[PDB]
Amino acid sequence: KYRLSEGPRAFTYQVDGEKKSVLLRQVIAVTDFNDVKAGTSGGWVDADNVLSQQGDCWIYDENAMAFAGTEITGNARITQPCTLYNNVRIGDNVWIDRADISDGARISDNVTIQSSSVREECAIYGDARVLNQSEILAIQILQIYDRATVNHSRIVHQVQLYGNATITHAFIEHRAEVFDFALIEGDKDNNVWICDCAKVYGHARVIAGTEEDAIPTLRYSSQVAEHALIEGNCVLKHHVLVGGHAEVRGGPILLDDRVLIEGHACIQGEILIERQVEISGRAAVIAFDNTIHLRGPKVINGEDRITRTPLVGSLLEHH
């Protein structure tokens, strides 16, 4: 499929703020294949094993770099200025565009990485799409697959994203997972933070608000699934489970220490819910532009309408 240019050339690239260079040879097609005509020059490599002679895989940009143990095979297309190095693997029908990939990252199947960067041991396969300035820093390994779509987001550590999850402007850390039809939607003024072992799946939605720091924050192992929806300045900490067709908005809101919210429950405004509280049915907890504090053990259901802190039971007596 191709031959390497004769004269090697040095190319610079920076790693962790340091400037580094490598000697590479330019790939030159010696025959027609796919959308590549013989005689055309592509990217640069540091060994003939970097780019497979078989299949349709190819490096199109003359500023593209692939070296240090990286291996491109199959029909993988690498377009625009890219930098792949340190035992990276790209095969099948993968598409890499103006993105950087390094440190043993393995991109397979029909994946797309565009205007983004991926670093360290992780597995991005299936029909996953990582786009628009996303940053994937791996460090169980981090996986993004199925039809998950990541947009201008930062995925780190050992996060798992799959199913049809649609993430945008989010920061998912540690061992957080987002799958099924989950929608994580931050905006330019507020990201969405999902940390630790939190999980968002089913048809759940987590939507940042427009107010200053109205950052939806899912911590520890709290979850949001089924048809639940969380928006605005909301923080979920220890053992919180939001499901059913519940809706949480307003802020600031804090859910912590064994809180279960499902059914038709609507929770809106500055509300603090904690300590064994279960809300379902058609209950409404609304704090009109006001504050509400709910503490259990306590079951709120049926048509309970709460517009002020209830001065009874667990609110006035703990232990």
List contacts with a copy of itself (CB under 8 A).
77, 79-80, 95, 97, 110, 112, 114-115, 127, 129, 131-132, 147, 149, 151, 164, 166, 168, 181, 183, 185, 187-189, 203, 205, 207, 209-211, 227, 229, 231, 245, 247, 249, 264, 266, 268, 282, 284, 286, 303, 305
Q: How far is the CB of 257 from Zn ion (least distance, A)?
A: 20
Q: How far is the CB of 36 from a copy of itself (least distance, A)?
A: 13
Burial of 305 (0-12, 13-18, 19+ CB in 10 A): exposed
Q: How far is the CB of 303 from a copy of itself (least distance, A)?
A: 5
In the bound state with Zn ion, the residue whose beta carbon lies nearer, of 127 and 187, is: 187
Q: Does 177 bind Zn ion (CB under 5 A)?
A: no
**Contact of 157 with 175, CB cutoff 8 Å:** yes
**Contact of 189 with 213, CB cutoff 8 Å:** no
Alpha-carbon span 14 to 45, nearest angstrom: 17
- Report angle CA 287, 291, 297 to the nearest 5 degrees: 95
| Residue 199 binds which entry of Zn ion, a copy of itself, none, CB below 5-8 Å type-dependent | none
**Contact of 254 with 274, CB cutoff 8 Å:** yes
Member of 6, 18, 19, 188 binding Zn ion (CB under 5 A): 188
| Residue 195 binds which entry of a copy of itself, Zn ion, none, CB below 5-8 Å type-dependent | Zn ion
In the bound state with a copy of itself, the residue whose beta carbon lies nearer, of 70 and 268, is: 268
Q: Long-range contacts made by residues 266-270, C-beta under 8 angstroms, separation at least 24?
A: none
Q: How far is the CB of 11 from a copy of itself (least distance, A)?
A: 23
Alpha-carbon span 50 to 287, nearest angstrom: 61
Q: How far is the CB of 187 from a copy of itself (least distance, A)?
A: 5
Alpha-carbon span 268 to 209, nearest angstrom: 13
Q: How far is the CB of 189 from a copy of itself (least distance, A)?
A: 6
Alpha-carbon span 79 to 59, nearest angstrom: 6
Q: How far is the CB of 9 from a copy of itself (least distance, A)?
A: 26
Taking only Cα atoms into account, the Rg of the chain, rounded to an integer number of angstroms, comes to 25
| Residue 58 binds which entry of a copy of itself, Zn ion, none, CB below 5-8 Å type-dependent | none
| Residue 304 binds which entry of Zn ion, a copy of itself, none, CB below 5-8 Å type-dependent | none
In the bound state with a copy of itself, the residue whose beta carbon lies nearer, of 173 and 202, is: 202
Which of 150, 121, 115, 108 is closest to 133 using CA atoms? 115
Which single residue is written with the structure tokens 């200053």? 212
Q: Does 209 bind Zn ion (CB under 5 A)?
A: yes
The CA–CA distances, whole Å, from 293 to 20, 133, 175, 269, 299 equal: 56, 40, 31, 11, 14
Binding site for Zn ion (CB under 5 A): 173, 187-188, 195, 209-210
